[PDB]
Design a protein around this nucleic acid. Sequence first.
DNA 1: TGTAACGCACTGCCAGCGGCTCGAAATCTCTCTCGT
Lengths: 174, 174
Amino acid sequence: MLTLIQGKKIVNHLRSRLAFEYNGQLIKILSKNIVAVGSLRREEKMLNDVDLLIIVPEKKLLKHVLPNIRIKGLSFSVKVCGERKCVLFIEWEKKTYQLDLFTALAEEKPYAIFHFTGPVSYLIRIRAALKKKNYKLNQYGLFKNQTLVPLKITTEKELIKELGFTYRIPKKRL
Amino acid sequence: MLTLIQGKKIVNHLRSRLAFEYNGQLIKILSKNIVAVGSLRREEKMLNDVDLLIIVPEKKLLKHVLPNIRIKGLSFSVKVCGERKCVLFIEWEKKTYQLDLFTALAEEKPYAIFHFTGPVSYLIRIRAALKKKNYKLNQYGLFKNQTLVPLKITTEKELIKELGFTYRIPKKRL
DNA sequence: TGTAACGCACTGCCAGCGGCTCGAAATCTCTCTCGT
């Protein structure tokens, strides 16, 4: 486990040294499209692991980003990897911790941000009330009978207000 | 062979005890989506066999319903079976009779109902005049030059009226 | 009229390139532990 600041100290070092491989074109990942999430964003004092989200602008990239990711200047290993989820072990300063990496689409940004902020308990209560209203909520979008519900929102905050719930900052979510 | 009422007495026993298997999930068949046809619906005195139509709501289900059909509390056999037609011999009251089972989609309902009601002669005479007008009639739909002709109808009666023919109740059809 | 389930010859067709067979290669679905 790592302290909150231990996780904080790591995040800033990464935003510059990011790239994924694709037809020889190693393409850097921009810090704007990067959002920190998980217990980290919840500002919990002690971190069980580290959780990061990625804003992917184009749909086809999915099958090439996470599978062919690259890391500058860090010893690491690969356990499991798909197009949406990727979990890697790392060697930061002689200790080993677990890291979680997820990708999301430009229209899923507020739906995704909200989901991965957590925690689980907070999310269940919302999905419970929506399941009691014939709705299905996930990190991608909102459904009714598997039919998308488009809302005139952009940020995670707008979504929660449009969902009709009391907005709460990460650490207030529980 | 069975009397008219003999088949009817059976039909009510079946509408409750019907199911088809699908990925271990045994799915019951609802009595609303069940319609009786053939010599039975025609109210003919003596029945050579029993004929039932089924309203399947979804297209993918076709290759799973009739092939994997199940009956509660009855020993039965299978003669021939596909996704559209299924013929079974049965043991009702120690005697052996033949049974016919057909499937149709929720949108094929009025076109299907008309077809399987019969009788043969009545159907041929109608379809003959339609063949003289570049039309093709079947249990599925209506065509002109192999292009489906959609009509603003729902029930078989509406279809017959839109076809422009004298409506006849089953026993009156001949 | 207008059609379905079937079994057969005839391919074509790839796991196989010669066979019409068994079960391969690859494209599936099911569950299971995971992830917030």
